[PDB]
Nucleic acid binder design. Structure first.
Length: 862
DNA sequence: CTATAGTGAGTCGTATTA
DNA sequence: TAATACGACTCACT
């Protein structure tokens, strides 16, 4: 083990060396240096900036010292935060805070004092530990290594790219460990809050706002980025110049994963990562010695893909994102949106100061969103411009408790349009007729043209040749591209395309082209159940046309509407018929006849069913859609000015929720029958079997466990949090008493255990597919560069051909030799129940579909 | 999922510390 | 001595 076995001084030297031999000495330090930014800002690096940081940092740092004197100069008990914070270096505490606070303000929703406070403690603790070794480390790579200039060089602008290291040739000292916080959450939060409290004091960077003072289920306290400060981020250029996200890319290939922890990043002066993100330590220890060569292999392969900033697009982005009217109708506006005017009628409540509260609300709900979207954007731009020149960069990877693979860094290939467009693959190959083809297939997809057959997609592309060429030429003048669904990505396609018209198929392209799965989960359920009626619906089977589940699910809603418009119930009486005299209320019930018509008066298209149905693989049922249709279709309808046909809004949702559910239930009968078998399993596995008046524990509440095809075990165990509050005098102004979930966990939550299985299962299932797909597309075919995004697979135009069939292969290969459901039963059988037994099973029926049809399936990527 | 978390005041009793 | 900070509890809440 790295720990214990070695001494602080060694551990602080090992990473640098094992990283200097490879890649050179110049980068060796750049890698550690860069990583060290997660904890402290560099003296030289800072001073060199003579941006926002240049004012925050110094004032913040001074305030931490002032406080330390204040605390000591006083008799009696010392604030709990002190105890922990006093140990840590003020230059690190300040940076971690500022840095971390901002990153948290990127979330348009969870900016409650607890989320923020928690983040700070989680990182301030990472410096508390590791800080020593981190210091030694800085010292060590700051000094020049001895002799050999050929080894100290390394890089050299050649054509070959840095090669990853051999897991077998890795020093023990690099084998990480202990990647879990060890502080009681109370202490953690304690630290957090004070840091925050000090940020405010020294620099009014943020403010605390009381939200919904009174509501027992909504009340809260949140952090808001102070106005003047927010306006600088949107207005100035690079106000976040020296404020890089917690996790940044890499300048050298990521440390391979050999164990449960300590992979990806290199420095030992940091808090090691963790193969699997988990709710607890022990929970993560269940992977200590599992043995899943394929999982690690898939991961390690994924890390390797080299990326490079897309210089050109970075050039366009740096500009347009500062226009008082950007051509991209999505880039958050610069000028705040002014609140609605008041009808002057203050003393009237017909609906004035009744709904006006709502009117203003929305505007406020948006300003916050738009503000925090600006920060995320700015973070990306900063991160983009920061590595714009780097020949190449890499991304370390992680997994969620289900398996799904994720890029650790904030700015990563799994981001949004702009984020994606700013990136492209490091090395490419000559496009060739094969590539040029799909490069144009992607560009089509990049626009809202992906519901049609390939040939016809191609038409669209060539039919806009002059357009594509115009924009590529002068992007700031021919903004046609910025009017496309995936603007920055399309624009990224134009730069390449034109690049082919200027070099022929001998052109070397690296743009990552992706093939996204139609409707993951519904695909997977369909395969494991061989449902033909449903698989086709998604797209498993070949067709002349691209199937559109959300669309075939809509045509069915319509025919029921048509019929219920002709026939159907008749508007019912009131509540006086059920209870004569006393309740003239609900003077309306509305039958199916009226309700349907109201729907036929609105339209009911593919939109009205998209979300309502795609949340099927999330535990949604007929009751779920109710509150879904309402806010996603009717509410904003009324709220706009239309939808005046929904007289009794609450009832309309009820009618539609039914129709969608009744409609889907027949379309993908399988998925439904499978989700049910799983809900009916987690239930028994959860429930606490008890005897009548004896209460003896026949068998306790257990967790649902199963293993995925590529051999990745997964345990799903939702638990009930043990809460508590804290009494914190805030800025000596009032007592902030936040409710917080304590690390100590108790009884299992059978309700969430049940309603969470299905959605979790498939996701885990498509996670293994994504992995197998990386191993196959890497061994069978040359594909070595991957742009994974859960249900979207991408590579370079050259390798596109092979990846396109690779996904089909693995997809097929697995469900032909694996009965996941049965394999599941082989889990909770010999590991669950003792008495009942019956009234549970009934494995769903298998279908008449041929998993081979997939290979030839034209529009069923993934 | 990407972890997440009702609020402040009025009152007491307690170990701690200049 | 006698300040200090804060966990514990109980309440009322636009």
């Amino acid at each position: 083990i790295a720990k214990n076995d070695f001494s602080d001084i060694e551990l602080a030297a090992i990473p640098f060396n094992t990283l200097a031999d490879h890649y050179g000495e110049r980068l060796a330090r750049e890698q550690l240096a860069l990583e060290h930014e997660s904890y402290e800002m560099g003296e030289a690096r800072f001073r060199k900036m003579f941006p926002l940081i240049t004012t925050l940092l110094p004032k913040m740092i001074a305030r931490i010292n002032d406080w330390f004197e204040e605390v000591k100069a006083k008799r009696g008990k010392r604030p709990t935060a002190f105890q922990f914070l006093q140990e840590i270096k003020p230059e690190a505490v300040a940076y971690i805070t500022i840095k971390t606070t901002l990153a948290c303000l990127t979330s348009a929703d969870n900016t409650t004092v607890q989320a923020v406070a928690s983040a700070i403690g989680r990182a301030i603790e990472d410096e508390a530990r590791f800080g020593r070794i981190r210091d030694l480390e800085a010292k060590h790579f700051k000094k020049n290594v001895e002799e050999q200039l050929n080894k100290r060089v390394g890089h050299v602008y050649k054509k070959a790219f840095m090669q990853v290291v051999e897991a077998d040739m890795l020093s023990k000292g690099l084998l990480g460990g202990e990647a879990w916080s060890s502080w009681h959450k109370e202490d953690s939060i304690h630290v957090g809050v004070r840091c925050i409290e000090m940020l405010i004091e020294s620099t009014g960077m943020v403010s605390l706002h009381r939200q919904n003072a009174g509501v027992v289920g909504q009340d809260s306290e949140t952090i808001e980025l102070a106005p003047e400060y927010a306006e600088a981020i949107a207005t100035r250029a690079g106000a976040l110049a020296g404020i890089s996200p917690m996790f940044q890319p890499c300048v050298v290939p990521p440390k391979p994963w050999t164990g449960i922890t300590g992979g990806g990043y290199w420095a030992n002066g940091r808090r090691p990562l963790a193969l699997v993100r988990t709710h607890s330590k022990k929970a993560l220890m269940r992977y200590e010695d599992v043995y899943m060569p394929e999982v690690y292999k898939a991961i390690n392969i994924a890390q390797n893909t080299a990326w490079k900033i897309n210089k050109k697009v970075l050039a366009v982005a740096n500009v347009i994102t500062k226009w008082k009217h950007c051509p991209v109708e999505d880039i958050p506006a610069i000028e705040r949106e002014e609140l609605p005017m008041k009808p002057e009628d203050i003393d009237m409540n017909p609906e004035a100061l009744t709904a006006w509260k709502r009117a203003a609300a929305a505007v406020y709900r948006k300003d916050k969103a738009r503000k925090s979207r600006r920060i995320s954007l700015e973070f990306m731009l900063e991160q983009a411009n920061k590595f714009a020149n780097h020949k190449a960069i890499w991304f370390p990877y992680n997994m969620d408790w289900r398996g799904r693979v994720y890029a650790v860094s904030m700015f990563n290939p799994q981001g949004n349009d702009m984020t994606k467009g700013l990136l492209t693959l490091a090395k490419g190959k000559p496009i060739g007729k094969e590539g040029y083809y799909w490069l144009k297939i992607h560009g089509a997809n990049c626009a809202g043209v992906d519901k049609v057959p390939f040939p016809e997609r191609i038409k669209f592309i060539e039919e806009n040749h002059e357009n594509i060429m115009a924009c590529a030429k002068s992007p700031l003048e021919n903004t046609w591209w910025a009017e496309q669904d995936s603007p920055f990505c399309f624009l990224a396609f134009c730069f390449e395309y034109a690049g082919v018209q200027h070099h022929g198929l001998s052109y070397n392209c690296s743009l990552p082209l992706a093939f996204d799965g139609s409707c993951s989960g519904i695909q997977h359920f369909s395969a494991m159940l061989r449902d033909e009626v449903g698989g086709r619906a998604v797209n498993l089977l070949p067709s002349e046309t691209v199937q559109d589940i959300y669309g075939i699910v809509a045509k069915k809603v319509n025919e029921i509407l048509q019929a219920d418009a002709i026939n159907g119930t008749d508007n019912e009486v009131v509540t006086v018929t059920d209870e004569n005299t006393g309740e003239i209320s609900e003077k309306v019930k509305l039958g199916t006849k009226a309700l349907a018509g109201q729907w036929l008066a609105y339209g009911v298209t593919r939109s009205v069913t998209k979300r309502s149905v795609m949340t099927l693989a999330y535990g949604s049922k007929e009751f779920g859609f109710r509150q879904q249709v309402l806010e996603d279709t009717i509410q904003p309808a009324i709220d706009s000015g239309k939808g005046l046909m929904f007289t009794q809004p609450n009832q309309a949702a009820g009618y539609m929720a039914k129709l969608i559910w009744e409609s889907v239930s027949v379309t993908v009968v399988a998925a439904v029958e499978a989700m049910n078998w799983l809900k009916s399993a987690a239930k028994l596995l959860a429930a606490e079997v008890k005897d009548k008046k004896t209460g003896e524990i026949l068998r306790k509440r257990c967790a649902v466990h199963w293993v995925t095809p590529d051999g990745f075990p997964v345990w799903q165990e939702y638990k009930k949090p043990i809460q508590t509050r804290l009494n914190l005098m805030f800025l000596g102004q009032f007592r902030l008493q936040p409710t917080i979930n304590t690390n100590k966990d108790s009884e299992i939550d059978a309700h969430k255990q049940e309603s969470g299985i299905a959605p979790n299962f498939v996701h885990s299932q498509d996670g293994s597919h994504l992995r197998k797909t990386v191993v196959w597309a890497h061994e069978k075919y040359g594909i070595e560069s991957f742009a994974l995004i859960h249900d979207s697979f991408g590579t370079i135009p050259a390798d596109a051909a092979n990846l396109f069939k690779a996904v089909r292969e693995t997809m097929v290969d697995t469900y032909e030799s694996c009965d996941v459901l049965a394999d599941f039963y082989d889990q909770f059988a010999d590991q669950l129940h003792e008495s009942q037994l019956d009234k549970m099973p009934a494995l769903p029926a298998k279908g008449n579909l041929n998993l081979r049809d997939i290979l030839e399936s034209d529009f069923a990527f993934a």
